[PDB]
Amino acid sequence: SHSVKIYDTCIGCTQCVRACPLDVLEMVPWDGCKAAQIASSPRTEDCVGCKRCETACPTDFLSIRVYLGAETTRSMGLAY
């Protein structure tokens, strides 16, 4: 399964989760930013690695990072 990490430059704009087509990420309470929220990746077993989240990120170089890893039926996006 791919790895998804969220670093402390997160502004909590929620576009991470809004872009995910597989519900890997969540908005969880935090205190580092004004929005009092941060992105989390509790369900990376369903991640396919399309990179939509990072495409949505505004911070100067991403606060969310997807590193493709061990390929499974789910991560390869297989319907068969």
Partner 1 sequence: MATKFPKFSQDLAQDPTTRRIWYGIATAHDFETHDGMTEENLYQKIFASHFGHIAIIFLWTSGTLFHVAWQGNFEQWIKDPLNIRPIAHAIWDPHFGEGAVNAFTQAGASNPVNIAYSGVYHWFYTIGMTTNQELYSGAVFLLVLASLFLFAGWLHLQPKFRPSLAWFKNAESRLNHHLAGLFGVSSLAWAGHLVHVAIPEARGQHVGWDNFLSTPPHPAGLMPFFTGNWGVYAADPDTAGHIFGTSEGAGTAILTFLGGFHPQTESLWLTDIAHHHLAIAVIFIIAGHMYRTNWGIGHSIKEILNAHKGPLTGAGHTNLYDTINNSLHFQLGLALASLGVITSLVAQHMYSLPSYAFIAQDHTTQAALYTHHQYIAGFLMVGAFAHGAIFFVRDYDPVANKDNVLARMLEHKEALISHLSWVSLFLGFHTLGLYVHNDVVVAFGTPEKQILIEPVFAQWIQATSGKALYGFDVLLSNPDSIASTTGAAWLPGWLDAINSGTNSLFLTIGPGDFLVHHAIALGLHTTALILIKGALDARGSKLMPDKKDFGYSFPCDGPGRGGTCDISAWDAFYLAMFWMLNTLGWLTFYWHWKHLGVWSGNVAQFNENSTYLMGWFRDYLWANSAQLINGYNPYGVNNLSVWAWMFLFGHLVWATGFMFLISWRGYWQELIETIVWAHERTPLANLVRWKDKPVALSIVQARLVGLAHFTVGYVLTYAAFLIASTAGKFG
Partner 2 sequence: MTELSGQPPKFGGSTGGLLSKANREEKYAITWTSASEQVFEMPTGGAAIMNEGENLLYLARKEQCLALGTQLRTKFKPKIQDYKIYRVYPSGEVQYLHPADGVFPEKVNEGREAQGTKTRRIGQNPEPVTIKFSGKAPYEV
- Which residues make up each annotated binding site for [4Fe-4S] cluster? 10, 13, 16, 20, 47, 50, 53, 57
Is residue 74 a contact point for partner 2 (CB under 8 A)? yes
Of 21, 25, 29, 27, give the one whose Cα is nearest residue 65.
25
Find all residues with CB under 8 Å of 16, minimum gap 6, and list them: 6, 25, 39, 53, 56, 57, 63, 64
Is residue 22 a contact point for ligand SF4 (CB under 6 A)? yes
> What does the alpha-carbon distance between residue 73 and residue 71 come to, in Å, rounded to a whole number?
7
Is residue 65 a contact point for ligand SF4 (CB under 6 A)? no
- Residue 40 C-beta: closest distance to partner 1, Å: 20
26 binds, among partner 2, ligand SF4, partner 1, none (CB under 5 to 8 A by kind): partner 2
Element (H, E) at 13: none
Is residue 37 a contact point for partner 2 (CB under 8 A)? yes
